[model samples]
Target: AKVNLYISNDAYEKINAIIEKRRQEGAREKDVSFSATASMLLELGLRVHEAQ
Candidate 1:
């Protein structure tokens, strides 16, 4: 499945910061995939919904 996402500039900077930190920390992979992030967000959303 393919979906489009819109991120505000602030959010983009924050995500980039995390990637930079990962790189600094010697993460095995420097590039983060959109699908992985989106899937993680979906999982987090499910938890929020369940908590409500």
Candidate 2:
């Protein structure tokens, strides 16, 4: 099977609200639309488990 977002089932509201809130400026941080913030957070979240 393919994989893009089975995770959507586990979506959180306050967490994303806070991320959008902290992003503050509303500037062009990446250009990947929401995935700009989303992908970075996604990768970092994965790293959190394996990271030191």
Candidate 3:
């Protein structure tokens, strides 16, 4: 059975908040980029989780 990940707008907002907090905390911009960059490496088609 194929399962669907229920990625809602709320989830996206939370993800964005976390990313922003990390940015304010002096986490490298590269870290922010990792979700996108690493997803390609990890072969994760959905970035909502991977990015978060």
Candidate 4:
């Protein structure tokens, strides 16, 4: 599934850090994407319903 979600600056910076790590390690885009998503999920948990 596809999602269009909003995140905080802290989250964005974390994602950027993960992307930089991937670059340094020569990781694939898919791996970076997965890692970023998983990291966000772990940090923010999941919601069953949307919030305003």
Q: For this target, which candidate reaches the highest lDDT against the unseen true structure?
A: 1
Superposed on all Cα atoms, the candidates' RMSDs to the truth, in angstroms, are 2.4, 4.2, 9.0, 5.9
lDDT of each candidate versus the true structure: 0.69, 0.60, 0.61, 0.66
lDDT value, candidate 1, whole model: 0.69
**Model 3 alpha-carbon drift over 4 Å, by segment:** 1-6, 34-52
Worst 10 residues of 4 by lDDT: 43-52
lDDT of 3 by residue, 1-52 (tens): 3334456687667667767777898777776763553344336556556787
Q: Over the stretch 1-52, how does candidate 1's per-residue lDDT look in tens digits?
A: 7777787988767666766776677766735554565467678899999999
Candidate that scores best on TM-score: 1
Better of 1 and 2 by lDDT: 1
As for TM-score, the candidate ahead, 3 or 4, is 4
Residue lDDT tens for model 2, 1-52: 3336545534656446746675675644544355455667778889997976
Candidate 2: regions farther than 4 A off: 1-3, 8-26, 29-32
Q: Which stretch of 10 consecutive residues in model 2 shows the poorest summed lDDT?
A: 1-10
> Which runs in model 1 stand beyond 4 Å of their true positions?
38-42
RMSD of 4: 5.9
- Candidate 4, residue 44: lDDT: 64
Q: How big is the positional error of residue 24 in model 2, measured in Å on the Cα after superposition? A: 4.8
